Symmetry: C2
Subunit: 87 residues, 2 copies
């Protein structure tokens, strides 16, 4: 069965909360969301999403939709947690 | 079917190559391996492995076996690409 697992969206985890104003020289679109992940024990990180980009709702969601990177000679999650429904 | 995809181990990609000596105050165990990944186009990053920790051979391999992180309020790949056989 399984994948990487952010099973979820606890109801507690509904949020978005935008760390900023309007920036310019430096500007700011921030929505933000609590999550957690499935390790060894189910758990608690924050996805600092896309501002376009509404909240995820209450469920079990997965992987890439960009999400990993290189940067350098590197996988990077740098760019962002990206989510999608448990396949 | 699919996962995250480092399908592989091209034969070219056999390596290990240890960026160092013996360190101490700062020391160094480095084995290293070329890989590539399945995006949009199949591709080319370096897994900077575990020194214990022999090379991966020529195939199609996957995900976590630690591999992602938090660090901070964060998934991190920081710690390391970790690989395993295509399930």
């Amino acid at each position: 069965m399984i994948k990487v697992e952010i099973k979820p969206s606890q109801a507690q985890f509904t949020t978005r909360s935008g760390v900023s104003r309007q920036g310019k020289p430096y500007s700011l679109n921030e929505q933000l969301c609590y999550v957690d992940l499935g390790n060894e024990y189910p758990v608690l990180v924050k996805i600092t999403l896309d501002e376009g980009q509404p909240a995820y709702a209450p469920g079990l969601y997965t992987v890439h939709l960009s999400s990993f990177k290189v940067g350098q000679f590197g996988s990077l999650m740098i760019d962002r947690l990206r989510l999608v429904p448990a396949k």
